[PDB]
Symmetry: C3
Subunit: 231 residues, 3 copies
């Protein structure tokens, strides 16, 4: 385990997702409101899944070697298994907040699936130049998601409760900034151009992941917006 310099960030990531999971689980114990239960369910599942996949990376299961550039390159494939489930869940949190129509939810989740799936293919592609073709397609899918979060959702929120509008706005901004960093880290890290070494890359992803999941969740679950308006 300790033979990989990035182990420390995997261990920290595992611990923080674990602690985040336990905290949200305990916090959601005293919740009977059906709307709030949905948000607690979605939001607690996110670090729970991330916990399992961080642990899989820490223990070495979620790592494979991919030959490109005439080298055996360590690729943590478990990230994509995580993101495949957790990024649509995060989008669902946002979509449910603003009472998105079903068509838009399907568009988001579908685009997200394409984003992660093509990122995975890019990560495992042995022809070096083609890795960036997949990166570009995945990034286009991300750009679509970001467009919808801004020019389909933000104007929907203004027509809703002020607490849901303000909470959505914060979470939207957090999401757009944090999510946009991922293709950059991939591009310059071990999966892409290889300018940033894997240990630093792992640190960067860990900071992004904890912020995008536990940070996000802390903001969401402390908000009154997740409760139905009741007396």
């Amino acid at each position: 385990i300790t033979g990989r310099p990035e182990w420390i960030w995997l261990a920290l990531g595992t611990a923080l997702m674990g602690l985040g999971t336990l905290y949200f689980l305990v916090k959601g114990m005293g919740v009977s409101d059906p709307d709030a239960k949905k948000f607690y369910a979605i939001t607690t599942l996110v670090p729970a899944i991330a916990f399992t996949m961080y642990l899989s990376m820490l223990l070495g299961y979620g790592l494979t070697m991919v030959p490109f550039g005439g080298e055996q390159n360590p690729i943590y494939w478990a990230r994509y298994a995580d993101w495949l489930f957790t990024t649509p869940l995060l989008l669902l949190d946002l979509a449910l907040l603003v009472d998105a129509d079903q068509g838009t939810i399907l568009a988001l989740v579908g685009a997200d699936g394409i984003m992660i799936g093509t990122g995975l293919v890019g990560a495992l592609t042995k022809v070096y130049s083609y890795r960036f073709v997949w990166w570009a397609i995945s990034t286009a899918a991300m750009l679509y998601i970001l467009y919808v979060l801004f020019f389909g959702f933000t104007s929907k929120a203004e027509s809703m409760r002020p607490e849901v509008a303000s909470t959505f706005k914060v979470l939207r901004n957090v999401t757009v900034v944090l999510w946009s960093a991922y293709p950059v880290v991939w591009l310059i890290g071990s999966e892409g151009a290889g300018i940033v070494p894997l240990n630093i890359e792992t640190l960067l992803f860990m900071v992004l992941d904890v912020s995008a999941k536990v940070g996000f969740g802390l903001i969401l679950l402390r908000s009154r917006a997740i409760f139905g308006e009741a007396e």
Copy 2:
């Protein structure tokens, strides 16, 4: 096929899931009620999926060799492919019975996914001691599911029709007893401590599977609880 002593239980399992599938399909032919159609759909799909995966194990496709303990260990991975889809379907049957809120359904299905996914990782893990780490996490996810089935669902059922309350109670009890045996069999069988040989392990899983799927389905689909109250 006959070169594996466990083939007989795989063959029997295949036949019983097949027959179970055909029986539920025929039985559901004369059903127009929209609620009953949901239960027939869910409940017929369960042995249909199990049929395909038993057949895959029988024909040898759903088997791989995993090196641990300095041995090549036969691991039937097809079980997890089965359970990944059939256990949430079984939980959906229960959840729909008691008209569970969406948040609770998501919690159940999500926990179930974690249960099966981590069981799969445990099954394929090459570091012997780590297999039991995954077993423990999976078992914790199972315990969460069982907690919800008792302390989130049972009190919901009492507020519903007597036929749905009584049927849920029976199916809940069947589910908790049968499902709890699976981590025990895994732990002592070829995936875990290796005390019980694979042929007996396969027998045990076959008895559990047929009971948890066809047995469960027979109880559910004979009940009046799957029909909306109509005149």
Copy 3:
């Protein structure tokens, strides 16, 4: 890339799915109706997914070699990854058109999953004779889907708006004819009996895919049936 004679059909397929995707995306820009948004979302996702998987086949990622018949046989596994997601989406388009009950939708999607999953197992099976066992099970699942599209849906459509009835009828007929060709092509092509060479097989699948996705989508998205009745 050009080393495989079928590359031309993969390239054409990629281009046509890409163009189809862009066309539906642009066309759906000026849509606010919640019902129409659902259909645009579903129908645009279908060629988008197919685009990615055609590209994966073109670049060689979505190809593996399967030993059977004492030969190394090129099997494009990416087709199943495509179909796993796009065929239920296509069925959802049809089901939503006729306002299918949830039980029937689950039956369709479930049968479809079995159809594609067993086709995949058949495609990767190393025992030649067993490949056709999987083909038969998959074809039985297809026959179930076709039965439901005719003897569960058609009589539902007649009870609905004339525009939805007529559009459903056309799309149903297109779907039944086109989908039925797939098991035939598989059976006689490289996955099955090997009578038709892979380059021609790839052409046939490309024509079917573009017709079943872009052709289908063009018919659906030009129809008034995807809009709620409004003044």
